[PDB]
Amino acid sequence: PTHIAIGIYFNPEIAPAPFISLIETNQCALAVRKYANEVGIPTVRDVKLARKLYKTHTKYSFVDFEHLDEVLRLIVWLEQV
């Protein structure tokens, strides 16, 4: 609710959909963010997507067809740069 962290993995040889590697909330979410930054994993703020995925998905699952492109757009930007 207050704080959300969703980890995203991606490998196109396995499926065209991104894969959710973690879902944490509140204080644990804040620790995920700090560690991610410390170990050089990009942390991207997108408040509506974070909520969406939290409300629709369980951890260790592929993003459903409905939200695939909204998630993939982030990976594509990070690749463009």
């Binding site: 704080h3 959300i4 962290a5 969703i6 980890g7 995203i8 993995y9 991606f10 590697s21 973690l22 944490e24 204080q27 644990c28 979410a29 620790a31 995920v32 963010r33 560690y35 991610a36 170990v39 994993i41 990009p42 942390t43 991207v44 703020r45 997108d46 408040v47 997507l49 974070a50 909520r51 995925l53 998630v71 982030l74 990976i75 990070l78």
Partner: peptide, 21 residues
């Protein structure tokens, strides 16, 4: 003081990004 378990740390290390609100 460690907040995260080993498996969560690994999951983070194995991700392309973390999406947050």
């Amino acid at each position: 003081i460690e907040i995260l378990s080993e498996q969560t740390k690994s999951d983070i290390r194995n991700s392309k990004l973390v999406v947050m609100n």
